[PDB]
Amino acid sequence: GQNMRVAFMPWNGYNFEDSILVSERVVQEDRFTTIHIQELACVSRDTKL
Amino acid sequence: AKDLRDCLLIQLSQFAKETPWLEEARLIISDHLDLLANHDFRTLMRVTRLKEEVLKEAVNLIQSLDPRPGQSIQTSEPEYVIPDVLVRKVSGRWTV
Fold it and tell me: How is it modified after translation (chain A)?
């Protein structure tokens, strides 16, 4: 995790119940950016032909 | 099409005329298929009176015509072959 500055204040309903407002700085800071690895495999499957 | 020339003619007509060696390729596909079948380059040059070695590019382009375009419809199906005897021969010591 990261230690992010927050505040407890209702901002135009964007924190109505469980909605979180985020900073463009964080995207610029690339915080919480995730890297995912996907695997693909193949086989020959020699046939009668 | 049921005819290679017909399918090739349709494929050529699909493309634009801006490509070079288009009319020559169409003429070859029209009635010069026999020379290509026998690979009779000299006979084809004698008959069609085409530019020497300039027809090689047109021949290559005609080779890039995707013969049997309907073959993509067919999907591969594995051939279930069940063998009777299995041999490993791992680290020598072959054992049937």
Answer: Acetylated on several lysine residues in the presence of glucose.
